[model samples]
Target: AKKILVTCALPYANGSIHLGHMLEHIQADVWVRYQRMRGHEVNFICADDAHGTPIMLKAQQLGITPEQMIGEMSQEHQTDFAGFNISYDNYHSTHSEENRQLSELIYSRLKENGFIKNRTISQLYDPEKGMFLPDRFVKGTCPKCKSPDQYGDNCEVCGATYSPTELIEPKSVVSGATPVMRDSEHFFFDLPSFSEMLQAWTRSGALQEQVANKMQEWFESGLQQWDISRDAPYFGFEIPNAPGKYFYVWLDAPIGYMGSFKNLCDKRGDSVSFDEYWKKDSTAELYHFIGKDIVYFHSLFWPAMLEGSNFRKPSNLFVHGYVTVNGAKMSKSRGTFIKASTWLNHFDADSLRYYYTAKLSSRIDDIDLNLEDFVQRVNADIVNKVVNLASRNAGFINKRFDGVLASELADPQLYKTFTDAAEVIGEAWESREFGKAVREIMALADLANRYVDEQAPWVVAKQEGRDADLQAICSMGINLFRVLMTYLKPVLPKLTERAEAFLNTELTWDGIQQPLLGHKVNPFKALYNRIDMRQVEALVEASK
Candidate 1:
């Protein structure tokens, strides 16, 4: 089996997990789980992105050290992920000793290779706080539209873009004090120097086409010298031989992946060299899943950093679009930014697991979760069609034939249809076309429902001399249920378990290809209940 290393973009430790965050986690987790089910040797890894200005600010506001704040957030993140059934093999913090060691190693390599340079640059410095404010730490009126209370990098009011120095009347968010322009020496990474290698690797089809195009366009427009180090009062790995300076958060973020691998190695007490995974080409395949907003950093800067350090390039970078609720970005003020915990309170996680699998495509387009659309899709697809067919028919079989699969099946087309669907679903999942895979699985559900309606299993069970007819109909129903479990296992493992218990057999990819025979079926209950509008309204209100 091929060994694959998979990672989701690390979530920052400054906020609670929301539905938007779950979209990426669920997508990656499902893919990893599917690969495992197919008996592949894959390691899934992720961690809390602990070093950033937001974390430092939040820690200060809470009267706690940055370490304590990130520690608490990582614990909470693990608990929430467990609730959603996301099985990460290992989760670490970027602030660990392992991370510091690896960060120094990578930094040393980049410096020796002449990718690192230092320059004195002017930045917004708050005299009251005695610190230079990062871009996100400064706020002022928009330079273009004169909109008040806009961020330093961009305007929320008029969508105008500007640098922190360009913001009119810039004030430090840390102390609300007027900031002064001060010069500071900081290290920079010349990303433009690696443009040729990045473009060549990207154009060679190692990266996604749309992502490669975007990165190429950004590089062509003009690549800026990335500030690899920040002045004092930033929370990150300190620059070696340069006191009072630290590596920028973006510079060390990808190194978190290596830090995590080191942690894994220590735990296992293995002598396996980390260089094989980082520098060698034949041992492991690396894949990363991230949101589209970070395309520039991941596709261009990340690859460049790896190449300069002689680390293996990422085999694939899967980028996904943002999540919107009801045609707008999720907003807590507008009461549409649903927290993951809040959603778990109202509905099962499987509902969401199935919903995203049915809706997400491999394209660069964003997927919307209109509340009404979410409810309708789950109810009509899972309840009315998929689960309902199994529930209604399973009960009929239990009462008539002591819960056993029927002796004879009449519909040969049903078997052919299910076999074809399973093959297509498997291919779709392998290619990461989750929406197509879900559609193919649900089409089997539709066919099963139609079979029940046409054959009338409930009606035949009541007939005096039609025992064989009833058996044949029940056989068809059980066969369809078997197919549903296999196809839906990647999205809803719990549902598959329940179906396996119902059929009194172990469910596997191969077993589903053959029809169930002579096994006692278990009693059935509704696999999914319809989501009530009142519950939806309550969730919306609570999110506010």
Candidate 2:
């Protein structure tokens, strides 16, 4: 394993880290943690995307500056992510000094590279607010499908992408005033200058196979000049030379990845070189875990920006689909768009971590949190299959054998079988096929249970003077349980904590080959409680 730098897409500071945000962070966290467990130096970094027009407007409503608004939301977002056990090496914000310096530095390099161009862009202007309106700040009837209340950028009803100027009857969201077409002198990134390079990168496995195929459509449609600078009254960093001009949110947001890791290095005061991790043609691996909606920005704009700024392109970009509740959109009216904090108040995080991994795969597939299915699947896999091995065997080891494992595993072949499955399970995880890995783990658990059933250790414990034989059988179960725990250590940290204590040792991949033999173990405590319908109901009520 090589040094790997992993990042989840930055969550916007305008709101909390909701269930939808969990899908990406959890995916990235699992991979980073797994790499670390395999003895690789891994840096898992993320930050709050704390800039743009929404932040400014929100601050005005709260009677505070944009800095104060984003500052407060940054901590709130960190708390929600921590509650879910996301192990980010550093969680900074785009509002930091480091981000500002990097943003300006990258923009300067782009300008020197002849990628920056001055352009007069037609934009929507809000006369009431006396400012230029971003696409999302306006709503209107769709030009193509004629759908009412459509956003200025894209039509939801017709699935059409269009400019804000193409919208019919555009209305500013700030006030009830109709917006007018206005000319704004802004800076643009000449996207066509690197068309061949971007087209090659898209086909260069910079994105997942599924994601690359999607990027093909954008290529076929032809690229356009990207407006990277916005006019005055924006919430982001200002341009170096252009007065009252700021880097657009999209431009600063992706640069945030580099900014965050650089901040982490400065904080740690370690010997690690920031340039070593970021310089072009560096051997260290870089991976980005993002949602499918942002593929255009990440796959096309992000790579070009990095190359222009002399940073290494990402090794692979994992694109995942949005998370829906109960196999459909999360309707606020139905109490389905549950907040991450709301979930922590009612349910445990490990259950969700397990549920998502069981459904996640290498493909960009939408994960669903079906209420009934969530309860059933979690209770079935983690509770019934995985944890049962420990609970059932702990009694015999505690009462009969004085909490000591047998000097030797009764079934050496069976022990080898469990250890051998680790390779297969690990490969699935490495390939980002967590669904297959999870399935393989549960299958091994099933086999272990069947073996325990045939051995009938409980019946053997009842016979007089058969204590040693009983200990051997149940200890075999415990040894098998150890193998399962090692496989799952990354997914369920809390459960792994309890497991380490019960087994009286540190849990690691190296420990998997050598099971506990002739060692005294602690009395077992229950690893997890089964999920109940009442718990699910309470979460829904709290969300409402």
Candidate 3:
């Protein structure tokens, strides 16, 4: 684990941080927390993608400027993430001078290298709004499935791709007026110019085999010029030399990674160099966590842009799928579109975090939040199993030794096995297969619980002349509990905080290696409560 910088796709500032977006952030959060706990140098960076047509339109609807809207929304986004315990090193915004500066500098590099071209192209213009429509600004029936209210570039309802003009009865979303086909001169990235370069980068483990194979299918002939500039009345950085045009959100949004890191470095003041992490030959490892929908942006255009600017392509691309409810995409009216704040109002945050981690793996697989499965997995694995071990044993330790732990280990070999699983589990976490790591952790818990059930520490306490034996058995339970909780600390920080107080020490990777002996533990308290099905229903009911 050398120098590492991790970034999640920036959440747009126009909306709240829904469970769908949480899929990426929580996935990245668990990985970064594990690396930091392992004594590795890791910086987790992310920001609000504050620029785009949606933000501008939403702002106007709210009677505010884009800056004001994004300003409030960025703060709200940060608040939502904090509530969910998504640890970000710097939650900056793409609507900053830092982003503008970096965007211009990167564009200058592209211009100098002749990777950018000026071209006259047909674009959709809105007559009522008196502006050019960006990707999401217009809506109409899907060209593929005839699904209504689909975005201009891609139809969410049909999962189809097409040009805006292909949409039937295409209408401007801002003013609901039919858009006209208009010609506009804009800057484009000559993406075909970097075909071989990107092929090499894509082959270098930036994506999974399945995703890379999809890229392979396209690399043969799918490459083309990419539009990087947008006609104004847009809310984004203006193109350096082109008036009435702005850097497209897709162009500057990925660059937000650099801008956020630079912003972080500026705050640190000479401690870290921004270029050291971004330069092509630098020692730092870069990873981007994106959704399956935008794998093209990360696997292809993102790397190409970096290469053209003499920066390194990402080291890895962790692409995950959408968060579905009951095997379907979350629909606002279907009681499946749950927000972060909504969850906080009803259930503990760790329950959702643990549930998601149990389902996530290395591949870009969709995670379905089936409410029944959510309750069963959480209640069984968490309350009945993981926390049950401590609750049952801690009672003995608290009452028998006056909250004092035994000084010696009854089984060092058993302790060794428990501690050994941390690294193996960590390997799964490092590979972005959190489901694997969680399964490993649960196996350890199963073994530990089996030991407690076999030993019957409760029965021992009732026998005569077995005080030392009882203390050792219960203390072993406490020790095993510590090891299991330490492995899960990255995914469940709040529950781990409670464990810290229970064990009377800090929970760390080093803490796992050392067994607690002769320590005074806190009174036995329940770590987590059972997940009630009715509360789960209410969560869905509110989401609707």
Candidate 4:
């Protein structure tokens, strides 16, 4: 068996997770679960990106220390994820001693390689606060578009990137005081030095094609010397040998993956070297799933850092688009930016899981959860199609015969239909085309529905001397249920359990294409209920 390592983008611990975050988690979780069912050794690791100035400022606003703030938020984040059934092998914080040690080790290696450089650069400083203003702390007009309300680093309106020193009349966001350009000694990472290695690795198809193309374009434009250190008042691990300066959050964030591995090793009482898993070539396939907005950081800088620091480069990077609510960016002012907890209040976690798997595609295409579309799609697919097949046939079989799987399909056409559907669904998931996978699974359910209509088990049960015929009909129902469960397991594990109870056998991907025999079946119940309009309306209203 092959070993696999998978990770989702570490979410910033500054705020609650919204639907957008859920989309990324769902995509990664579905893939991980599928691999597990396929009998592979895989570890999925993620943590809270607990460093940086936002955490420090949020703590100050709440009159608490940074540690207390992150602790409370981390706990809340874990609870919310659990409610949504997003399981992680390890959920850690980037502020741990383990992470700090790993980060320092990596930084030292980079420094030795001459990839690190220190220089005095002009930065935004607020005289009133007697502090240097981080990019987020300063706001000014865009140099090119002259649009106000822009951050020091980039303009959201015109999409121009510039340094804070270039901003005219920059004001500190903290105290609304005009900031002056002052020289500060900052550490920088020489990314351009590794450009040849990055280009070679990228062109070798080590990354997804779209990701590679985006990275090639960025590199061709020019690689900038990334500032790797920030001055005091920043919440991060301080740079060793450089007092009052700390490693930038982005510089240390990727190291969290290694830190998580160290934690796992410590817990298992294993003395495994980090190089074995990360530096050397091994069977462990590395994959990263992130949002499109962070493509530059992950594809360009991340690969350069790994190759430069003698770590194993990523085998693949999956980029996904953002989530839109009712065709607009989720807005708190409009009450459309529903928190994860808020959605859980109105619907089952499984419902959202199914919905997202049905809607999310592999490419960078934005997914919209229109209120009307959500209600209609769930009721149509889950209630009318999937649940309805089991409800109508399973009940008829239970009333007349002993609980047992029906024999092979008497109708060869029906058997072939299900077999083909199952193969296609499996392939779709393997390719990370989740939306297509779910559609294929539901198509099989539709075939089961058609099988019911043609056979009319209800009509057959009413007639006399149709015992064998009845058994055959029930057999088809059970077989269809089993196949559906195999595909559905990745999206909803609880549904798989319910399915096992009904079929009276442990469900696995291997037996999905075959029929079970001579096993007792449990009583059947509706797997999913239709979502009511009023309940959905209430959820939308509450979200607002």
Candidate 5:
């Protein structure tokens, strides 16, 4: 078995967890669960990005300490993830002691290795608030478009990206005071120094084609020094010995991945050493599941940071695109910006999990959560196709045969057809071709239902003393259901749990070779129930 560590992009502490966030987490959770099912040692880790100017300012606005605010937000984020059955081995915070130590250590190593540079830079400072302002904290007229009341350097009206210093009549959003340019000593990471290495890594086929192409575009634009330090009155780890200088949130955010794993190792108190996994020559494979927007950070700066600091880089970066609703961006005005906690009130986690899995593929393409199609797809796929196998056969096994299966295979050849699919299905999952995997499983579901339709179990029960034939037919259907459920266990955890109880056996990856003959099975109310557009309408209204 191979050792694997996987992480999703850390959710920021300033916002509620939404369906968009769930897409990436669910994607990683499914892959990690599949790895575990295949007997690999996988560590699934994540954390809340708890340090930023927004978190600090928002905490002050709410009349609370930053720690208290992050504490509550962290709890809420964890609660939402748990409600979704995300299956993270350890969910931590970027503000932990573990992060503090590691962040400082990495900064020191980069400094010693001559990759750190310091210079004085001019930034807009709010005099009344006595703090430097981030780009978004200043409002002004757009330099390019002359749009009034534009925030920062970007203009919403004209789509112009410029420097905040170029904005006309800039005013601080914090205190509404006229902003003034102030010089502050800031540190930079020598990203340009690693451009050759990054270029080599970019073309080495370690990234998706789209991602590699984007990186090449960025390289042609030229790599520059990365600003790694933020001035004080900021919320982040303090740079060691540089009083009032803090590591920028971007600099320490990815380190949170390492800190989270370290926290897990410390809590477990086992032989799992942090260095053993992070050392340059370690054999464990590490993967980061991230959004397309952050590929520059993860693919280029992240590996450069680790290489400069003497740590192991990621094996691969799995990039996914943003989640759109009904073929457009999620909009609060349209009530499609649904939150994670809000979803649990209307539907089970398995529904959304299955829907997303059906739409996902091994590409960086955006997946749409079209609500109208969502309702029909879930009802048709889960209710009619998959769970129908069990619900249609369970009653006959319970009442007609004293809750017992047939003693022998009704159609051994059909059973072999279902079991023969294991290799291709497993390969699809291993390669992260999730949509293909779902299609294969559902096609098998269609065949199983076709078999039942052809046999006419309902007709055999009524004809005459054909009870033996009826029992064998129904049991064959149930056996097919068992194999399909085993394939779907990673996708639908709660449903699989119910199936295990009913089958009186656990679903293993290789257990489908032997069918459950002569074994007593239990009854269930419903393996899965149908959903309609009314629930979808209710969820959207509630989100609004």
Candidate 6:
């Protein structure tokens, strides 16, 4: 078993947990659960990115202290994640003391290593708020395309990257005040210094093809020193001996991953040493699941920061694309920008999990949550193909045989077919070929259902003196259901829990070798019921 540490990108504390956030968490959760099923020691970590200028401003608007706001948000965020059964080992906050200490430690190490540089630069500052405005806080007409209300750093309409000062009629997003350029002393991480090391890692074929290509482009364009410090009025860990200067949100946010792991280690009081997992020479593998938008931060700046600070880099970065609803970006006006909490009120988490898994792959391709297709796919696969196996055959076992399974295998060769496919299925999961795994699993489900249809158990149970035949056929079907559920355990946690209770056995990858012969199984009421278009419509309306 391998020791693996996994993290999902931290959700910002200033907003509600939306479907876009859920996509990454669910994707990571599925993979983490799979590794655990294979008996690997996996520590799945995540935390709320609780310290930032937006969060502080939001707290003020709500008439609450920053601490109070973050506290409430942490609870709400954890609640939403729990509803979706996101199995995080530690859900901490970037504002925690652990984060402060670790952030300071890393910054100090980097400074001592000569990778930290100090310089004076001009930045947009809001006089009314008495604070330096981050690029996102300054808005104006795009200088390139003349698009109105564009962010200072980039134009959404024209895709132009420029300085905030280049924007026309720039205004502070916070107070709607005219922003002025002010000089300030700032610190930067010498990102260009580690460009060679990062390029070597990117070329080693550890990243996705698209990600590697993107990195190569970045290398060609050239790397620059990353500004790691924010001036006073920032909401983050203070730089050591640099009063009025704080670590930028991006810098501390990734460090939150390590801080969260450290919190987990302290809470468990186990031998899981923070250094053992994070040391440069440690054998434990680390993976980060993030959206493609943040690939630059995770791939280039993050690794450079860690290397400069004398720590281990990520084993791999699992990058996924944005979640589009109905073939377009989530539209709040269209009522498709669904929240994680709002989703559970209308549908089960397993439905979404299954659908996303079917669409997901190792590549960084956008997954569309088409409402109409979602209903059809869930009903067709979960209701008809998979759960139908057990629901169709459970009657004979519960009513006639007193929940007892067959004494011997009625279709031993067929069962072996399912067992033998484990190697291929396991490989698909290990390689992060989620869509392929789902396809292979559903194909087997079709065969299982086919076997039942051929057995004609419903007709067999009606015949006189056919009790033994009915028992054997239904038992075989139930066994097949058990195996399929085991395969799907990672994707559908709540369903697997119910299946385990009914099957009287825990689903395991190796446990399939020995079928549940002469076993007593329990009855269940509709393992999974079909979803309809009506529910989808209701969800959309509610979201609106």
**All candidates: CA RMSD in angstroms?**
2.2, 2.3, 2.7, 2.7, 1.1, 1.9
Residue-by-residue lDDT tens digits, candidate 4, 378-471: 8898778776766776775676776655655666677667766766787788788998998788878888888878988888887999988977
TM-scores across all candidates? 0.94, 0.95, 0.93, 0.93, 0.98, 0.96
What tens digits encode model 5's per-residue C-alpha lDDT throughout 122-204? 98999999999999999999988899999987899999999888889999999999899999999999999999988888889
List lDDT for all candidates, in order.
Answer: 0.83, 0.87, 0.87, 0.82, 0.93, 0.92
Cα shift from native, residue 164, model 6 (Å): 3.8
| lDDT string, candidate 1, 215-325, tens digits | 767867988789888777888888879898888888888889888877987897865746667774647888898999988888888888888888888888888888899
Lowest lDDT 10-residue stretch of candidate 2 = 199-208
Q: Could you tell me which residue pairs clash in candidate 4?
A: 403-521, 406-475
Off by over 4 Å in 5: 143-147, 158-160
Q: Against the true structure, whose lDDT is highest?
A: 5
Native-vs-model 2 lDDT? 0.87
- Tell me how far the alpha carbon of residue 162 in candidate 1 is from the true structure, in angstroms, after superposition: 4.3
* Deviation (Å) of 481 in candidate 5: 0.5
Error of 2 at 149 (Å): 7.0
Total clashing pairs for each candidate:
1, 0, 0, 2, 0, 0
Q: After superposition, how far is residue 330 of candidate 6 from its true place, in Å?
A: 0.7
Model 5 scores worst on lDDT over the 10 consecutive residues at 268-277
In Å, residue 150's CA in model 1 sits off its true spot by 5.0
- Give the 10-residue window scoring lowest on summed lDDT in candidate 1: 273-282
Model 2, residue pairs in steric clash: none
| lDDT value for model 5 | 0.93
